[PDB]
């Protein structure tokens, strides 16, 4: 329509004309914000006790958000909780404003006096993400029902011979289609799922048996898909997974890092 699809997807020549780009700071910086804004989303969501799903739906709102507004006029550290908030409203595990705030605050301000609920400072804070939320809405054009790549990947898991031990190394790897890649604004959940697995099992050295009667075992999750691309992308994904300055004291390791438990 206006459009059904053309809405939230862009060309590499577009994210260069970022709207945070028409302002005085870098790409090397911006690429670096988003990952550090989603990164915050994670921390709080874990602290709030919400599904890793909601976290992801925020990360997609965030991504989708700053393709319309600069990071100069809406700082990532205050659109983050604004969106995690409206997210866990949508995916349905509500948490209440004063609950989000009280967390965000012990996120960003570890050694502070836990907030006075009556201070003009506070009754202005809440006054704000309230107005922000009206923005993060008017911005995603009220399109909050978000489709993820994990919904798909969950589809072609044991629908091939795949050791669980390395069959969910793709589930996990999807969530980076979000944290550290601009992927979610470029190609669809399917196409993007194809990648989070063709890469997942080149570290796992197990590969895909091709399906017998004349159709590839990856052409069953999306219609237009080439290795010419998927190889092209897993490059990006990796030289982006390693275009990172060793900041990977990594994302959903707080105390869920090591492969499950020994100690």
């Amino acid at each position: 329509r206006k459009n059904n699809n053309k809405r939230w997807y862009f060309t590499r020549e577009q994210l260069e004309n970022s709207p945070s780009r028409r302002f005085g700071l870098d790409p090397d910086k911006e690429l670096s914000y988003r990952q550090q804004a989603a990164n915050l989303l994670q921390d709080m969501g874990q602290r709030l006790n919400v599904s890793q799903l909601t976290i992801n739906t925020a990360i997609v709102y965030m991504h989708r958000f700053y393709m319309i507004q600069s990071f100069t006029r809406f700082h990532r550290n205050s659109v983050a909780p604004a969106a995690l908030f409206l997210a866990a409203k949508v995916e349905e595990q509500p948490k209440k404003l004063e609950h989000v705030i009280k967390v965000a605050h012990t996120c960003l301000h570890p050694q502070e006096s836990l907030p006075d609920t009556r201070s003009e400072a506070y009754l202005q804070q809440v006054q704000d993400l309230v107005i922000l939320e009206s923005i993060i809405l008017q911005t995603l054009g009220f399109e909050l029902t978000i489709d993820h790549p994990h919904t798909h990947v969950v589809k072609c898991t044991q629908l091939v011979r795949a050791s669980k031990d390395l069959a969910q190394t793709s589930y996990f790897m999807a969530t980076n289609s979000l944290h550290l890649t601009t992927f979610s604004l470029q190609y669809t959940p399917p196409v993007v799922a194809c990648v989070c697995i063709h890469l997942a099992c080149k570290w796992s050295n197990w590969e895909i048996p091709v399906s017998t009667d004349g159709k590839h075992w990856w052409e069953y999750v999306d219609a237009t898909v080439t290795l010419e691309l998927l190889d092209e992308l897993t490059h990006e994904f990796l030289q982006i997974l390693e275009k990172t300055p060793n900041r990977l004291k990594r994302i959903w390791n707080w105390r869920a890092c090591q492969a499950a438990k020994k100690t």
Binding site: Q36, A37, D43, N77, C107, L108, A121, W254
Partner: peptide
Amino acid sequence: IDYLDASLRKKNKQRLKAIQQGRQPQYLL
């Protein structure tokens, strides 16, 4: 772990936490 970069924010945490002599966070989130 850290949207809390050292330091351009790790820094303000130092500036805020050191108006802990009678001035307070204007904005604190």
